[PDB]
Amino acid sequence: GSHMRLLWDYVYQLLSDSRYENFIRWEDKESKIFRIVDPNGLARLWGNHKNRTNMTYEKMSRALRHYYKLNIIRKEPGQRLLFRFMKTPDEIMSGRTDRLEHLESQVLDEQTYQEDEPTIASPVGWPR
């Protein structure tokens, strides 16, 4: 609680400004259908918000994973990065944010160390 700063709040915030038209924009704002225009940069934007460095979309989608079950966000039928905000911040603050507020930290830790340079500190081969 305290103050919502979850992924969906930030991404929805991007949807409220024409700056990010090349990053994300509304396809049907009333249906809450929105298109992620530049997923790499969208991930970077959210990384920026989450004080994270190298956030790729495949790396960001891990947070979205939960939203699919929370039926917050779905992928539109027969689309790429066309999604649907089934519910907005106001609706999501019904209670399911507790796992999300907890998860964002975790998803940012689940994967590799936001690797920029493929280094071998030990015989590994990282799951980039």
Swiss-Prot record:
Q: What are the subcellular locations of this protein?
A: Nucleus
Binding region for DNA: 5-86
Crosslinked positions for Glycyl lysine isopeptide (Lys-Gly) (interchain with G-Cter in SUMO2)? K69, K87
All disulfide bonds of the chain are: none
The source's superkingdom equals Eukaryota
List membrane-spanning regions: none
Q: Its quaternary structure?
A: Can form homodimers or heterodimers with TEL2 or FLI1. Interacts with L3MBTL1 and HDAC9.
Function per UniProt: Transcriptional repressor; binds to the DNA sequence 5'-CCGGAAGT-3'. Plays a role in hematopoiesis and malignant transformation.
Similarity section = Belongs to the ETS family.
State the protein's name. Transcription factor ETV6
Q: Which organism is it from?
A: Mus musculus
Question: Which part of the full protein does this chain span, and how long is the full protein?
Answer: 335 to 458 of 485
